[PDB]
Write a protein that binds this DNA or RNA. Structure first.
Ligand SMILES: [Mg+2]
Ligand SMILES: [Mg+2]
Ligand SMILES: [Mg+2]
Ligand SMILES: [Mg+2]
Ligand SMILES: [Mg+2]
Ligand SMILES: [Mg+2]
Ligand SMILES: [Mg+2]
Ligand SMILES: [Mg+2]
Ligand SMILES: [Mg+2]
Ligand SMILES: [Mg+2]
Ligand SMILES: [Mg+2]
Lengths: 124, 109, 128, 44, 223, 225
RNA sequence: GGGCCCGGGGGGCCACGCGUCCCCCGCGAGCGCACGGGGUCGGCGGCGAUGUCGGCUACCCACCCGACCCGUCUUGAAAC
RNA sequence: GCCGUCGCUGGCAGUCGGCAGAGCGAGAAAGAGAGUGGCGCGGACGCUACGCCGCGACGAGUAGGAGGGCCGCUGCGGUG
């Protein structure tokens, strides 16, 4: 279970960074890079991940499908959204709220998508 | 033109006999030799004005060597017209026995 | 024109002088690193007036501004670009410091990436 | 020292104070009226 | 709906009315005054029409945001503060200016503006101080007064009139006395000045400058 | 349907507002009654003395029932008996204040700590200003400023003490529940006397400060409260 | 004096529906001001590119107050 | 005001959202109970629970005991 798996990795993980009085987690599907039970991208049945597209255009939204929990190859569904800034967030907002897919990650996903999009603008 | 400040002397710091509280200065003001004549001065501005080597900006003027530490009179001290003053920085000990300016503002009359 | 923190409160230090070890001014063999005096007659230990001061938890810094840099950020050492992307979502409160032992070739990539992500770098102009 | 704080604790303080203010102003007037009568009587 | 009526409870002191609850109840006649129990705009388009959203969602969200503040009371903006004035500063009073380039010059008080700053005049022909604003804490009010009760000061002389106009530098930019200011100076001066000359030697007093000299101590002398 | 539930919510809120409104009138009228009571007590003693004097006799007023005790000595070098009695009075710190209801048991305790305390008989104004400026309740073993009447009502309401005026009335008149209302109050933390002291190391009658100074405690209380 | 300051024949009340039997004789609406659960201004001014602005601490120097050399045994150490 | 300790063996799993309805600080036990008859698609942060938050009191120390060190040194297994 998620709680059992958190108790094994909360302080022992190859993704754990403890430095400068700060703690970070570098695993995928962690929307804040935060060593937290809520934001851990590995232990929950459902997780939300936002990443920049392989080309610097748009974001890739990752959702964990329900069935294949023990099958890493088919576990994650990737969707590339390369619309305008407001449209991208609206898609992400709906993919979470309407589906009730981790509604508590809604703003974390939306804040991460804005940060990735803002990064892809020309550097001044 | 003419002088617009009262002549005060930086007598010393606030102290007992063997403890010195540098954040408060004791000011002797000319002509104020009773505790009841200090009421006019309470809350008035004080200015330790001095000169240095390197030029510094001057408000409303061009750079020169004048410098000032500002302060204000906070309360009377003793029975003989001394007042306690507090400055934005503690006064240097080299200023003891030297002029401190006491302004006529903030005016309460 | 540098990146600013989310907030910039006033930093208050109860003390700014370092605590120098007792008698570290009298010998070269005594370094200035603090050591709790423990002699029976030690006048520093007994807190005599006008003597060297000992550290104690009372000097502790405000939890809200502790470890905060003068710019208002908090530093986080990074050794490569991958370590830099953790600060993506805390870029208004934590800046990046590139470790000393990162070659000049690798600094440019880190410094460039941090500019894209709006992460502040404390030593961007080093090893140029 | 804070009127509205006192009323949250003792609402009757407001009545007491109003009576005092009115009683003291009323009492002050009489002393003035009684003084003027004597002064005019002395003038006579 | 009825017209507003002035408060029937005259203020005894701050926060306390003259009349009690039951006294006010009768005064208000409450015995007989008993009582018992868009976001979208549709438009045509050359689909035919669209439901337009008045306000659009943010297109960018910062990584972090600050929380709201707890609510307080009594912290009004400056424009709503109540303006105070020393009882010694009455219109026509002669004030000594303590700061600025005009420090030590004796001027004539005209009125207090809505921001609490004082309006004074030299007059310009006696000490070269024009219609100018000054702060009451930075003047000494003397006991010498003139009766300007019959002087009409223009109503357009407000805080906004005297507010500095920003000058942009890319060399410098020089303040220029507007023609309206000169006209206003003569309008006010032409009334105050004859009243100054009625008092003997008063005009010479306003030309002189205040200073502290040997043995003169402010706490000892009446102004 | 939600309209029916909302009405139930509004009606419940209305009931609480009315219960609050009626409780305000209770404490408002309680204060009005104590004011009359205090006036009658003050006027009664004067009337009693006047009639004794008229008849050529002496009216001896009742020995005071209430005392305010102040600790005026530090904590260094206190004998074991004094140290225990000062903790029982709850004067564990210098310039701490407490009310004590007087009787043979307590007057003899005050004699033991005589060199360490200044005490006397407080008047009504002293009880007022003490409890208003420096009144803290002992609620759940914590020191809570008495900034709300609900604080008093929750703890002492079972004894019908539900407002500051009831608390002042219980203390001043030494009511039947003085013990509970008084122990509820935290020891008053008073400031150093503004104007100094005469000599803390000798009795009041000797020109010092220690011991019983009777009503002269009020002059001290003004300078410390 | 006390009896909600008993009963009969100018000034303040945290009195103010009524059907009644009778001791005695459960929701009105709003609006506004604030001594009201810890500060705000919906207030301003001056200066700024080659000599000036900021830099606690740090380097040197000066001054005022404080200040005897540590470890140790010891009732007691700056200890002749 | 700030730091830490101790205490409340205190509060927070309720982020229960358009399969929605925002409360449980309040003087005084126990239900924001269940029923049967008489346009918009929106709503900050949080929660490394070994975490986060609140409130109150307190803080000298040799010999000595204990706790915590994202204090420091060298080598081994894992990991980066
Ligand atoms: Mg010893
Ligand atoms: Mg002693
Ligand atoms: Mg005094
Ligand atoms: Mg003795
Ligand atoms: Mg010396
Ligand atoms: Mg020496
Ligand atoms: Mg030895
Ligand atoms: Mg020996
Ligand atoms: Mg020794
Ligand atoms: Mg010797
Ligand atoms: Mg200790």
């Amino acid at each position: 279970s998620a709680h059992l798996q958190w108790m094994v990795v909360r302080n022992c993980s190859s993704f754990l960074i403890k430095r400068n009085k700060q703690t970070y987690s570098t695993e995928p599907n962690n929307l804040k890079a935060r060593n937290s039970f809520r934001y851990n991208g590995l232990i929950h049945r459902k997780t939300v991940g936002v990443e920049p597209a392989a080309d610097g255009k748009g974001v890739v939204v990752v959702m964990k499908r329900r069935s294949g929990q023990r099958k890493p190859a088919t576990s994650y569904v990737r969707t590339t959204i390369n619309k305008n800034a407001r449209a991208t967030l609206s898609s992400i907002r709906h993919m979470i709220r309407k589906n009730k897919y981790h509604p508590d990650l809604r703003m974390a996903a939306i804040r991460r998508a804005s940060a990735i999009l803002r990064s892809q603008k020309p550097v001044m | 033109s003419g002088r617009l400040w009262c002549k005060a002397i930086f007598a010393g710091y606030k102290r007992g006999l063997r403890n010195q509280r540098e954040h408060t200065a004791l000011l002797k003001i000319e002509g104020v030799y009773a505790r009841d004549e200090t009421e006019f001065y309470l809350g008035k501005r004080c200015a330790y004005v001095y000169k240095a080597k390197n030029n510094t900006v001057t408000p409303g003027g061009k750079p020169n060597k004048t410098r000032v530490i500002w302060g204000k009179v906070t309360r009377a001290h003793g029975n003989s017209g001394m007042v306690r003053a507090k400055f934005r920085s503690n006064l240097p000990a080299k200023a003891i026995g030297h002029r401190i300016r006491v302004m006529l503002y903030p005016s309460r009359i | 024109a540098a990146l600013r923190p989310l907030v910039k409160p006033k930093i208050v230090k109860k003390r700014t002088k370092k605590f120098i070890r007792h008698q570290s001014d009298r010998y070269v063999k005594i370094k200035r690193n603090w050591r709790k005096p423990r002699g029976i007659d030690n006048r520093v230990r007994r807190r005599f007036k006008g003597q060297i001061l000992m550290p104690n938890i009372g000097y502790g810094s405000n939890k809200k501004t502790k470890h905060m840099l003068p710019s208002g950020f908090r530093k986080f050492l990074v050794h490569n670009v991958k370590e830099l992307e953790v600060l993506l979502m805390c870029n208004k409160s934590y800046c990046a410091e590139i470790a000393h032992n990162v070659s000049s070739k690798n600094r440019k990539a880190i410094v460039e990436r941090a500019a894209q992500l709006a992460i502040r770098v404390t030593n961007p102009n080093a090893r140029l | 020292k804070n009127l509205r704080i006192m009323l949250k604790l003792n609402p009757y303080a407001k009545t007491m104070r109003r009576n005092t203010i009115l009683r003291q102003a009323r009492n002050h007037k009489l002393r003035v009226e009684r003084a003027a009568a004597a002064l005019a009587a002395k003038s006579d | 709906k009825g017209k507003p009526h002035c408060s029937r409870n005259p203020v005894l002191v701050r926060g306390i009315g003259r009349y009690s609850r039951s006294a006010m109840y009768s005064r208000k006649a409450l015995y007989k005054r008993k009582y018992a129990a868009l976001a979208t705009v549709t438009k045509p388009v050359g689909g035919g029409t669209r439901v337009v959203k008045l306000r659009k969602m943010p297109r960018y969200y910062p990584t972090e945001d600050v929380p709201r503040k707890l609510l307080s009371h009594g912290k009004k903006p400056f424009s709503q503060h109540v303006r105070k004035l020393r009882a010694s500063i009455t219109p026509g009073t002669i004030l000594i200016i303590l700061t600025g380039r005009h420090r030590g010059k004796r001027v004539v008080f005209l009125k207090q503006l809505s921001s609490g700053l004082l309006l004074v005049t030299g007059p310009l022909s006696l000490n070269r101080v024009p219609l100018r604003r000054t702060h009451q804490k930075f003047v000494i009010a003397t006991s010498t007064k003139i009766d300007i009760s019959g002087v009409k000061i223009p109503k357009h002389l407000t805080d906004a009139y005297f507010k500095k106009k920003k000058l942009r530098k890319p060399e410098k930019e020089k303040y220029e006395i507007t023609e309206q200011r000169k006209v206003d100076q003569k309008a006010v001066d032409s009334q105050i000045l004859p009243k100054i000359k009625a008092v003997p030697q008063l005009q010479g007093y306003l030309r002189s400058v205040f200073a502290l000299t040997n043995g003169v101590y402010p706490h000892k002398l009446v102004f | 349907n939600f309209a029916e539930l909302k009405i139930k919510r509004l009606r419940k809120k209305f009931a609480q507002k009315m219960l609050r409104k009626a409780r305000r009138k209770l404490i408002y009228e309680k204060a009005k009654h104590y004011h009359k009571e205090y006036r009658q007590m003050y006027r009664t003693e004067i009337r009693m003395a006047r009639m004794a004097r008229k008849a050529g006799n002496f009216y001896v007023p009742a020995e005071p029932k209430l005392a305010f005790v102040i600790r005026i000595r530090g904590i260094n070098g206190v004998s074991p008996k004094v140290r225990k009695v000062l903790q029982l009075l709850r004067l564990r710190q210098i310039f701490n204040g407490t009310f004590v209801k007087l009787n043979k048991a307590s007057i003899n305790m005050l004699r033991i700590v005589e060199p360490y305390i200044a005490w006397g008989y407080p008047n009504l104004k002293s009880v007022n200003e003490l409890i208003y400026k420096r009144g803290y309740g002992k609620i759940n073993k914590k020191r809570i400023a008495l900034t709300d009447n609900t604080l008093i009502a929750r703890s002492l309401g079972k004894y019908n003490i539900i407002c500051m005026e009831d608390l002042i009335h219980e203390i001043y008149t030494v009511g039947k529940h003085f013990k509970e209302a008084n122990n509820f109050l935290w020891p008053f933390k008073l400031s150093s006397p503004r104007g100094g002291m005469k000599k803390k190391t000798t009795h009041f009658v000797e020109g010092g400060d220690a011991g019983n100074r009777e009503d002269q405690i009020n002059r001290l209380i003004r300078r410390m409260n």
